[PDB]
């Protein structure tokens, strides 16, 4: 069957010189992951629980 999930709040993006700063404000334990689209990627993933 089809069963329902909520969309997480959009994060706060702060620009920079070849960097970004993300303010994350979770309401529930949410999974956050990121990777780079180059030759060798620097993957990362974690379970964000509190605001970080």
């Amino acid at each position: 069957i089809t069963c329902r999930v909520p969309m997480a709040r959009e994060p706060t993006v702060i620009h920079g010189k070849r960097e970004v700063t993300l303010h994350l404000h979770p309401d529930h334990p949410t999974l956050f992951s990121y990777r780079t689209l180059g030759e060798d990627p620097q993957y990362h993933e974690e379970w964000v629980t509190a605001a970080v």
Partner: protein, 438 residues
């Protein structure tokens, strides 16, 4: 007419190809890549699912001994125990205080939902490539699905196109993969018939509907407690649930080159690597004769503004004089700068404006309008916005032109030093000649 070219394998990047033949006006072909797919050839090794332990009701014999024989079942385990006094809710079960005997057996089978939830082990081989390509020229604008193999030949508007083969045999899948739901993992698995308890592969089956099953889960039986009717057993927990607990990281969030991984069928999409060669055969009806094409003479170029950014940050203007109004095909004959429009309208006024994008401090390139050519060179300033949400629309070149300011300073310094060194050479030669004359 036959032509051959190469295009970068970048999704969404426009490509312009120039076709020039004697007796006809030049033609510009626009080709774009909408979506690509890469699929390996898979041969199934086995599948795994959570198991269930079937235990039947124990057998009890009063004043008798019963021996149990072996059976052809997965991990069948049977045992016989002597000297038991089972109790029930009414009272004793048999008279014989110590002559009773209990037979207990257990085995393992696949779960009732193995048909719906299972993990598959695959071996990966050479991979194919399918692409969707949009082609534009004249009054033709069509998207076609092709195989990038050097085999498929498609026909668009009476024109024959052959694509491929790819120039970089690279695949993100390792030799052995494990597929579950919509995730692929690049991990190795035990061979068939050599599974170990507690980890992945505790039970294996050649296919979902196969009738043979290999299991190794340490079904050790134990003696029943006195005054009780039960069968105890110790078994290492299912390895499939453990693997689901700490499988690791999926290839979905790790694949290089921004490779979007999808399942059913296993494939990778929008993988940007290498370049695709294109061979085309054009009919003679897609060109225009020189006589009815416009004539351009005395074409000079200048740049109004430039700012090297991912967007189309540049504007150039071309001045010219003609003999009749018409439409021309324009092109840039270099890789530093990429244009935006492949066609232009030429009137008697004599001024056209074009857009372009670049990534060098000072570019220099040749721009062709119909049969006329001109040279454009200008200075650009860096942008201010640090991060943009769209991919670059310029081929990455950084080296400036030999007549740019930095290289101009380098040339002037080098020329001064070289002239001074050459003067020193000449004076030394003259002195040594006048010395040897004596």
């Amino acid at each position: 007419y036959e032509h051959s070219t190469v295009m970068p394998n970048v999704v969404g990047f426009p490509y312009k190809a120039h076709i020039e033949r004697p007796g006809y006006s030049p033609l510009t072909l626009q080709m774009q890549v909408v979506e690509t797919s890469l699929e390996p050839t898979l041969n199934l090794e086995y599948i795994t699912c959570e198991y269930k332990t079937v235990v039947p009701s124990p057998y009890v014999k009063c004043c008798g001994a019963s021996e149990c024989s072996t059976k052809e079942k997965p991990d069948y385990q049977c045992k016989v125990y002597t000297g038991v006094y089972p109790f029930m809710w009414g009272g004793a079960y048999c008279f014989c205080d110590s002559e009773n005997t209990q037979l207990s057996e257990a085995y393992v089978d696949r779960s009732d939902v193995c048909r719906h939830d299972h993990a598959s082990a695959y071996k990966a081989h050479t991979a194919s490539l399918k692409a969707k390509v949009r082609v534009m020229y004249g009054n033709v604008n069509q998207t076609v699905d092709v195989y990038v193999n050097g085999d498929h030949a498609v026909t668009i508007g009476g024109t024959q196109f052959i694509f491929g083969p790819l120039s970089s045999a690279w695949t993100p899948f390792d030799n052995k993969i494990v597929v579950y739901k919509d995730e692929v993992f690049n991990q190795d698995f035990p061979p068939y018939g050599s599974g170990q308890p507690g980890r992945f592969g505790d039970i294996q089956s050649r296919t979902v509907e196969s009738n043979d099953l290999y299991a190794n889960t340490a079904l050790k039986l134990a003696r029943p407690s006195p005054g009780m009717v039960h069968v105890p057993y110790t078994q290492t927990p299912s390895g499939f649930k453990y693997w689901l607990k700490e499988k690791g990281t999926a290839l979905n969030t790790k694949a290089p080159f921004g490779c979007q991984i999808k399942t059913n069928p296993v494939r990778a999409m929008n993988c940007a690597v290498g370049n695709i060669p294109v061979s085309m055969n054009l009919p003679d009806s897609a060109f225009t004769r020189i006589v009815e094409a416009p004539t351009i003479i005395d074409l000079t170029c200048t740049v109004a503004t430039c700012t090297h950014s991912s967007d189309f940050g540049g504007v150039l203007t071309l001045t010219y004089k003609t003999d009749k109004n018409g439409d021309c095909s324009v092109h840039s004959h270099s890789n530093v700068a990429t244009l935006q429009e492949a066609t232009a309208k030429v009137k008697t006024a004599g001024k056209v404006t074009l857009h372009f994008s670049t990534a060098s401090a000072s570019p220099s390139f040749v721009v062709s309008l119909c049969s006329a050519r001109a040279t454009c060179s200008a200075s650009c300033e860096p942008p201010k916005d640090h991060i943009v949400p769209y991919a670059a629309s310029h081929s990455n070149v950084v080296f400036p032109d030999m007549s740019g300011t930095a290289l101009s300073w380098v040339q002037k310094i080098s020329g001064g030093l070289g002239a001074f060194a050459i003067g020193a050479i000449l004076v030394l030669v003259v002195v040594t000649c006048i010395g040897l004359r004596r």
